[model samples]
Target: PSTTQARVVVDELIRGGVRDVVLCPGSAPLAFALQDADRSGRIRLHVRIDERTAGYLAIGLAIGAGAPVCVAMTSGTAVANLGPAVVEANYARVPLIVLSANRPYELLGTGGYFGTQVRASISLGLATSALNATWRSATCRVLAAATGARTANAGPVHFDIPLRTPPGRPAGKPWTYTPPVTFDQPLDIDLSVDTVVISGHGAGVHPNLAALPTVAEPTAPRSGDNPLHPLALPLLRPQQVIMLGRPTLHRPVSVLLADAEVPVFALTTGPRWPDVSGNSQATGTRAVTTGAPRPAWLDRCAAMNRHAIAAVREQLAAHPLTTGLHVAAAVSHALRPGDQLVLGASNPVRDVALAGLDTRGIRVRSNRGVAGIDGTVSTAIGAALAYEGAHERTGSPDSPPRTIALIGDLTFVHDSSGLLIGPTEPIPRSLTIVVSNDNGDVSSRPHDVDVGALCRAYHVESRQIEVDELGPTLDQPGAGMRVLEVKADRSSLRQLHAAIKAAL
Candidate 1:
């Protein structure tokens, strides 16, 4: 039956470290097979009726879990529905696997219903690899491409399975099977004088190098442990920048790297590098990363970083009203050790990155992969679900991780459909959304409809607060998915920008 085919695919994915599977219901036989596989307790299955939503949901799971995820659908338009998510994943370098169930090739020209052919060619260049189930190397290739073992960059991979109504069985259990290939390891680096390490998402650096002047993205694991410089401006005037992993987040930082004449060394295991427009070379070294004595120069930079942060805080104290920066600062300060924060793409993520705040023990996430604002709310909701599930499985009550999202008003409206969850659907009890309403418009562009009224139509429990009252409101935490609408003014952006520049 299709049971064996589905089990084999799911098992291969499980062996490749994929723990989450987002299914958009399709072919009944394949669905039952997948359901049975999910019941085996090895994979967490998330079901969504809309294929596009399912695609982004899987992306969110992958981002939060720090691993690839599988998204399955059955036949025709359902397969085509995954195009948007796959495109985003391709640009973001996230590993996503799309498993599509279809009828055998013999049925392609048949007059019967559901006879339409579904192929990876329909993915419109987003898929890294497209192969039929009959290919002998399909499983191994899918595993490799999905996990980015075959290449340095990760993206979406598709498999078009033309299985019979009842497929063949496997000779043995799936867990017993293992792939023949291994993934690449992290690149080692030889520190150079006047070197500043820039750690981005998925980048791993030696703990000893934390002494250097470092600018880490929010997704960086060590970011919370160390003081990170804000990317609002050129904070790191390094003679040479040693990049760790793919740090493609802030536009200013990317521009700085492109404009500066400094020599750049990218430490990566693959050929692809971050989207820095410059002649950056790859590095190869065997330097050991262990606990070591701190460098004096590193201490000096740390002290300077402290001074900069203190100066900014003093300047913010004078205003006494919350702007985007102030809201981000308050959220940064109030973040607990075990809490998780997901930032909306446009203004929210940018403001927080510019805040140059210090964090400890808390984790931060954003959809910086493709950096699209389309799925901000849905992505955050998915992240919350994933984070909650992760903590519950491996954590304690006293240290529960709470998830909070900061999104712009336009962004909230963009993904308003994300909040429309069925009563029977799994709800995130520890999730909260802080919506920054910039006086009904967040940008210089004209708008006709009121954002607050749009949110009210969603029937979401919301609290309205003036910009001056935002600081105190953010200090208190609430449960479930509620929106804290803070009144903002786009006109003040120029003044705020100037003030931040002066403070920094």
Candidate 2:
């Protein structure tokens, strides 16, 4: 009998803790609301040619920020793009707010361009929850409350906003801009009930690194040719740093202690790009991304000119800790005596090797055998099983080394089903999945690549990240299968690479 106005409610819904907003343009009465929100500056707007890319970007930011991100696209072909991201988000359990603009009922079956009752309702069961309704003030309020709850709750949420041209204009007062709401619930999933702390990826976000676990320099009695050991370096007295690559570099959200996937891009414009693939457009850009389209000369030789090279060099020299070496070092410092480091294939493992590891105590593993992002979650699960078996054999009854996996968003989605496949199958293990979700395939692939679909197709938990906020948002929770969408840019990689080279 009563429904809230769509525009006002959704606008208010968006205002709550929403840091990023991504959209694919078309035509819709709701587009005007997006215009208003963009103007408000409360949320950052990302425009993409592909709604699928847009969806993943939102998931990436949300994963990175350790919170929920929203996406709005005009109904029709746009709805199709959301499917992949939605499936990935569901299994990853990354919070995503999808607002699909739809045509009015009057146009349905009447043949007015893209007109039909969408099956968007199906996505809800696929994700955390999906809401379909005409725009009403009540719906906005409900969405606002839900938005707040979703952030506090930490899971993906979807809404289908039905629009009408409005018979007239100016209906009473404007929508209220309510502050974001947050909820906190402390629950232990990975660690045993009495487990003291976690190490590697999970411990990165924790304030007290020492409490988790750490392997001192050359902790291993003998080098085992493991990459993580070399990367572990002594940054400060008693404090060592480790440089991590792609997937392993990320933790807490990694699928080691929790069995999850990660998302990161691979930027290869020389050393300028670390892992930034997919679409590279944003409201405000910092350094030019290597992934950005450019002429060969201008991109390479021209950019290598004395002044340009020096300019780029400055970015690297500033932050060495973020470098491959430093990141590997951080990973090493973060490792405990009995920990298992599961590095993803590709740059993740190789970069770890280049970091110069001293893997004496810690065991090293990788997905190089498959290297297709196919069995990372499964492999990590297997590794966890091994760790558990070893732990049982220790006789000391210690906490055992935590299982840490580092992966990119593409990799995470590629094996999203692996998460649902494990624990659901009654496997008693928790592996955290740290995702380097830079949005799209940094190695030159399209975004909106649906990992969520893969997860849902197999029945899995879902999650997302909106952008890249690597250093912060570490206080966030990790799901049974979590997805930490690191909202990163190519600039961070450039700085890190240069830092490592300079140190070398």
Off by over 4 Å in 2: 1-6, 40-42, 104-152, 164-504
Displacement of the residue 365 alpha carbon in candidate 1, Å: 1.4
TM-score of 2: 0.37
Off by over 4 Å in 1: 7-17, 37-43, 102-137, 149-153, 163-192, 223-228, 231-237, 269-271, 275-277, 284-300, 319-321, 395-399, 439-444, 448-459, 466-479
Output the number of the TM-score-best candidate. Answer: 1
Q: Candidates' TM-scores?
A: 0.80, 0.37
Model 2, CA-based lDDT: 0.42
Task: State the RMSD for candidate 2.
Answer: 22.5
Give the top-scoring candidate (lDDT): 1
lDDT of 2 by residue, 1-504 (tens): 012234444454553555566667786545665566667754445565556656655654554334456777775787676666665554334456777656556557787121221112312111101122233333334344333443332334556655551321234322443454532222212211111111221111222222212322221122112122222222112111111112233232132323212122221111122222122211110112222112332222222223323433354346533333333434544555556666666555654544445455676665331244454554565455445544555697554446556666666776554554322122314445555555536756346665555555655544454322322332333443444444334446655655544543
lDDT of 2 at 305: 28
List model 1 lDDT by residue over 20-68, tens digit each: 7888776555577567767887777778877877788888788776677
